[PDB]
């Protein structure tokens, strides 16, 4: 095939042009995102029960829906939370590879099985079934600077004028309003209601009657009286449109003739649907849009398109309204792309320089400069064919493959240049001969590297999907590199390279290049002498190898584990957790202090603080808050002191002083779904109807025992909430029936006043919006207010709530958890420093097996799919090593010689582990993929040394040592050229301290360190391996 394309250079050029066009086309059309889909497909069922406690939600909604989630395909597990915010969220997690649309429609359809069994109030609010996603493209903040608008006012404007246009924008998948559109708020007064002998029941009845759409009919409708001229629609009662109209709603006509209106017993205004959450941006009122990227869309196109749409809306804003971008990933993704393109371009420039330094002709430097871009472009075409996107993982996959791609280029050209210099053959016949020596090895190398990388794509779960991004990228790039090395590069060599006279090594030249050639020819003789001396005393080097293998294994265990390094993304978070039962006002005090800190003590770093009261990672009680800190541009924050890690530590230590509130800052994870490495996700399950109280006692028993093993388990804690004081009120059924007071009037009066009641819809400026009746704040605050609420008896007498009720303080759950339909309690924790996650899990199982009868357990999330992937690893390592051996065995026609190549593995791994350990980095995904490329290239170097040596023994009848010395002599220059070019190529990644530097460091550090040892050791150890192996099996 090389011979075919040496005689046919134009055909070779045609294949290169087609690959370039396919690649160029792919690069322009390929979707762009920071990360691809990793987490398995999840569907969430969300329902609101206004004014409902955790148990009410669980026992009337959650349990009903959970029991009807049957006959749905590929369900791994089901979890739910019922909490006293009046909210249920059931998350159904499906097998990796499940069609998310088929998963959602099957859940949705089965929910209708349950919809008629849910309370009317829940059916009214609606039960949302959505494909779960915890990755936003950006957060668009909307604030009022002149202090004329509340968050309710801003939220309504965004809902009415912005959201729909942003939802319509190209590439936008989902938009979440931070707040609600206006609701018609009827704030009832119990004193005024009792004064007119009225109740919340009368208010709801009047609103339902006087705010409604009534169907009338038609004038001259069919069948008509023949001769009818007119056919017109009859419009009767239509919905109310203003606070003025709602205030004019008639409640009763008094005996004297005077009229009680709704404004006479209630304050009426446009307000929010929910007041549990208060959003502030630098202290000012704020709403916003959480924007998620649509399937297979371009993140950079979408963000530009969103900013283009918001620019079109700018002119029509009210005065004071201002757009802010507290969160946007696209600036980070731009830098990630640019830095990778810079690395790839600089890598090509470095090959050119190294190629010229050694070969000293511009014609030779031109061939890799052509061949490498052709392979890179082609890789994008293959990524497109696999339905892959341009993301952090696929892009760094190509950077990790650079070494392998430039080697294919360097190896082919260098070997032709050597053959011409040593034998004085013309370029064409030199190329034919040269390819004859390497074409068999290059094919063998392709198979060996495939056997190394392909199995990495068959790991399951989240981490499996991450490894699959690198695997297919590196295998595709490598596959095309070998195709180009067998098709294009030989053709280029045979037609472009200019001839070299026999015995001309450029020693007779003058200047720097004449000196270099004399220095390197002299250095090659020093090298072959050294190997000559090494092969006389192979015994001590077998010992030195075993020391390297021991030191490697030691450093492996000493290197702590992680997934992806933490990045400075110009954003971080501050948790604000007050004691349980703390009010909204108190949580705001602490948030205002947290905001005041960042805008004063970090004035030079912090751009904005987004203080969300009554929210953590989800809508939480009044005692919980969160602050999303947005930093200034990376350029304006020079030094390690002005980065997230430093600001985090400073803030956390500063907020340690805050009393009656736990406050701490922390960086965002690269991908939130992975969690922490060495971290576990445990579910304690009530298997025998023990109840909440007994499961808590069992949880406390497990947590107490885990605390007695700090050597194994660290920070083993509940993920949920503790029981809090709740106000139990008992309606006396006898007293109610004796006074002629109905239970429906009692329960509606209590529910509507204290909890709020969603009555019906009204139309505000052409948009359908909710009508809510509720007590004005001051009449639903304290237990004494209960007695101020009167219910009308059958005889017309107004009876106070105190007359037929009794109250007492008790404890209950503000958040009840369920796992696979059973009462559960989620426990988070991690393996202690120096311990593996599997060991920490084993102890948790041991401790769990000594709990009371009917208390079971299970592993979820990362722990579930960590046990899956852990069972695969041994089988995939085994297949990889077996296929590598078999491919080498076929190449060399020998069961023994393969071992000489396979012994190279540790030489690169030791250097990687040294560099990582020294820099204080971890055994992360980037490091691990880096090992395989370092192992891959060292294997490639070894394969060609052994092939050259064996061929000299087989064909020219040379001795083992004679062939080995002549082999390593010939392979010295090409090995040094690749190593020099590639070490310099990854040096910018090692020293980088900018944005995305965490990943760059993890890629560069392990590779640089690995390449240095892989280069230095292999040139001395590979000849030992071959000699020792050949001797042992001869």
């Amino acid at each position: 095939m090389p011979n075919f394309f040496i005689d046919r250079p134009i055909f070779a050029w045609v294949i290169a042009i087609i690959i370039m066009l396919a690649g160029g086309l792919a690069i322009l059309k390929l979707p762009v995102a920071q990360y691809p889909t990793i987490a398995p497909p999840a569907v969430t069922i969300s329902a609101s029960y206004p004014g409902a406690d955790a148990k009410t939600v669980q026992d009337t909604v959650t349990q009903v829906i959970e029991q009807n989630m049957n006959g749905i395909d590929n369900l791994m597990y089901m979890s739910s939370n019922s909490d006293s915010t009046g909210t249920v969220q059931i998350t159904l997690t499906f097998e990796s590879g499940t069609d998310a649309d088929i998963a959602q429609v099957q859940v949705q359809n089965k929910l209708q099985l349950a919809m008629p069994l849910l309370p009317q109030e829940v059916q009214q609010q609606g039960v949302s079934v959505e494909k779960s996603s915890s990755s936003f493209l950006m957060v668009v903040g909307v604030i009022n600077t002149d202090g004329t608008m509340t968050q309710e006012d801003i939220s309504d404007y965004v809902a009415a004028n912005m959201k729909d246009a942003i939802s319509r924008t190209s590439g936008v998948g989902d938009v979440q309003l931070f707040g609600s559109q206006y609701a018609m708020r009827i704030w009832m007064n119990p004193n005024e209601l009792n004064k007119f002998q009225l109740t919340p029941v009368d208010v709801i009845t009047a609103i339902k009657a006087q705010n409604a759409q009534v169907a009338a009919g038609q004038l001259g409708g069919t069948p008509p009286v023949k001769g009818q001229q007119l056919n017109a629609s009859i419009i009767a009662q239509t919905r109310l449109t203003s606070t003025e109209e709602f205030g004019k709603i008639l409640l009763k006509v008094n005996q004297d003739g005077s009229r009680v209106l709704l404004r006479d017993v209630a304050k009426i205004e446009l307000g929010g649907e929910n007041y549990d959450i208060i959003a502030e941006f630098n202290g000012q009122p704020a709403s916003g849009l959480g924007i998620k990227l649509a399937t297979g869309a371009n993140a950079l196109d979408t963000a530009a398109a969103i900013r283009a749409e918001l620019a079109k809306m700018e002119p029509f804003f009210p005065s004071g309204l201002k757009i802010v971008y507290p969160y946007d990933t696209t600036p980070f993704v731009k830098i990630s792309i640019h830095e990778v393109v810079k690395t790839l371009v600089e890598a090509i420039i470095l090959v050119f320089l190294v190629m010229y330094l050694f070969l000293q002709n511009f014609r030779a430097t031109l061939i890799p400069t052509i061949a490498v871009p052709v392979v890179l472009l082609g890789t994008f075409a293959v990524l497109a064919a696999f339905g892959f996107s341009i993301n952090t993982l696929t892009m760094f996959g190509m950077v990790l493959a650079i070494g392998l791609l430039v080697d294919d280029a360097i190896v082919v050209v260098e070997n032709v240049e050597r053959v011409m210099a040593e034998e004085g053959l013309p370029p064409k016949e030199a190329t034919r001969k040269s390819m004859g020596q390497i074409q068999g090895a290059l094919v063998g190398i392709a198979m060996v590297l495939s056997a190394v990388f392909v199995p990495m794509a068959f790991f399951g779960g989240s981490t499996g999907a991450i490894y699959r991004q690198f695997s297919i990228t590196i295998v595709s790039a490598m596959a095309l590199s070998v195709l180009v090395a067998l098709i294009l590069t030989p053709a280029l060599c045979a037609t472009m390279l200019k001839p070299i006279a026999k015995g001309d090594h450029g020693e007779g030249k003058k200047g720097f290049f004449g000196w270099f050639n004399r220095m390197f020819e002299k250095s090659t003789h020093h090298y072959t002498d050294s190997v000559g001396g090494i092969l006389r005393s192979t015994g001590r080097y077998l010992v030195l190898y075993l020391i390297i293998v021991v030191g490697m294994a030691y450093l492996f265990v000493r290197l702590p584990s992680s997934f992806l390094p933490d990045e400075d993304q110009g954003v971080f978070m501050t948790m604000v957790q007050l004691p349980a039962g703390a009010t909204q006002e108190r949580t705001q005090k602490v948030l205002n202090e947290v905001t005041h800190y960042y805008l004063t003590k970090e004035k030079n770093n912090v751009e904005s603080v987004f203080a969300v009261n009554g929210f953590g990672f989800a809508p939480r009680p009044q005692n919980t808050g969160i602050a999303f800190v947005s930093l200034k541009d990376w350029a304006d924050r020079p030094g390690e002191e002005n980065k997230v890690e430093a600001i985090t530590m400073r803030a956390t230590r500063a907020f340690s002083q805050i009393k009656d509130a736990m406050v701490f800052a922390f960086n965002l994870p690269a991908i939130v779904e992975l969690g922490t490495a060495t971290g576990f996700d445990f579910e304690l399950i009530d298997q025998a109807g023990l109840g909440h109280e007994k499961l808590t006692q069992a949880r406390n028993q497990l947590l107490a025992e885990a605390a007695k093993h700090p050597d194994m388990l660290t920070s083993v804690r509940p993920n949920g909430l503790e029981d809090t004081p709740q106000f139990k009120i008992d309606i006396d059924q006898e007293k109610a029936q004796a006074l002629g007071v109905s239970i429906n009037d009692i329960n509606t009066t209590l529910g509507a006043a204290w909890g709020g009641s969603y009555v019906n819809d009204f139309i505000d400026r052409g948009r359908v919006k909710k009508v809510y009746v509720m007590s004005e704040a001051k009449y639903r605050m304290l237990p004494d207010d209960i007695g101020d609420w009167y219910v009308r008896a059958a005889d017309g007498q107004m009876v106070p709530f105190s007359a037929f009720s009794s109250s007492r303080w008790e404890y209950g759950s503000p958040r009840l958890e369920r796992y696979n339909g059973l009462p559960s309690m989620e426990i988070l924790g991690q393996a202690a420093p120096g311990k593996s996650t599997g060991e920490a899990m084993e102890l948790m199982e041991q401790l769990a097996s000594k709990l009371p009868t009917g208390v079971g357990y299970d592993w979820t999330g990362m722990s579930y799919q960590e046990r899956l992937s852990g069972n695969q690893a041994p089988s995939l390592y085994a297949i990889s090593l077996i296929v590598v051996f078999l491919c080498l065995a076929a190449l060399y026609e020998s069961w023994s010689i393969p071992f000489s190549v396979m012994l190279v593995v540790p030489l690169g791994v030791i250097g990687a582990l040294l560099a990582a350990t020294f820099r204080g980095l971890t055994n992360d995904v980037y490091f691990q993929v880096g090992l395989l490329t370092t192992i891959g290239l060292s294997a490639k170097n070894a394969i060609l040394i052994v092939e050259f040596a064996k061929d000299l023994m087989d064909k020219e009848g040379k001795g083992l040592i004679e062939a080995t010395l002549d082999a390593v002599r010939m392979r010295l220059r090409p090995i040094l050229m690749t190593s020099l070019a590639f070490i310099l190529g990854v040096m910018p990644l090692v020293i980088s301290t900018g944005a995305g530097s965490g990943a760059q460091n993890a890629v560069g550090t392990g590779v640089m360190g690995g390449m240095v040892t892989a280069t230095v050791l292999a040139i001395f150890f590979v000849p030992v391996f071959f000699v020792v192996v050949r001797r042992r099996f001869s």
């Binding site: 004691p579 009393k659 004081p725 237990p783 009794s806 303080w809």
Partner: protein
């Protein structure tokens, strides 16, 4: 106080050895949350006997009442903690203590059918004819619940 709030969590959680250290450091035993529950209230509710005894030894108010007038004996009696009911009554707990509803420890014990506790309360001089705001005795509760054993004891 800082320690007063730490004692509330310890007494509730049943952390005997922490309560021991807190009593030595002088953590306020009359510490109360928003609903007016002392460490003794919490210990009585969650049924932590040793902490009930340790708190009473360290001068805790045995007749401390919450913002709705409920005492620790109310909580002990209602949730069936026989040993705590005895310890409280021996340390001078008001057996006829009325909450804001006029409910007594006997009412709550009768409602949950705690026979042993009822007999202990009756022994310490619980007013069997004591009526709540609805004019109901512990006997009326026993008849309504259909508790034939309890109905006999209160006759």
């Amino acid at each position: 106080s800082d320690l007063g709030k730490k004692l509330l969590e310890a007494a509730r959680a049943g952390r005997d050895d922490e309560v021991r250290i807190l009593m030595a450091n002088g953590a306020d035993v009359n510490a109360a949350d928003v609903v007016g529950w002392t460490p003794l209230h919490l210990a009585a509710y969650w049924g932590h006997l040793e902490i009930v005894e340790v708190l009473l030894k360290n001068g805790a108010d045995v007749n401390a009442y919450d913002t709705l007038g409920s005492t620790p004996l109310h909580l002990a009696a209602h949730f069936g903690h026989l040993e705590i009911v005895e310890v409280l009554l021996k340390n001078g707990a008001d057996v006829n203590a009325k909450d804001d509803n006029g409910i007594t420890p006997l009412h709550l014990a009768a409602n949950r059918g705690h026979l042993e506790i009822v007999e202990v309360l009756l022994k310490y001089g619980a007013d069997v004819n004591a009526q709540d705001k609805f004019g109901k005795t512990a006997f009326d509760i026993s008849i309504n619940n259909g508790n034939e054993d309890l109905a006999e004891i209160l006759q």
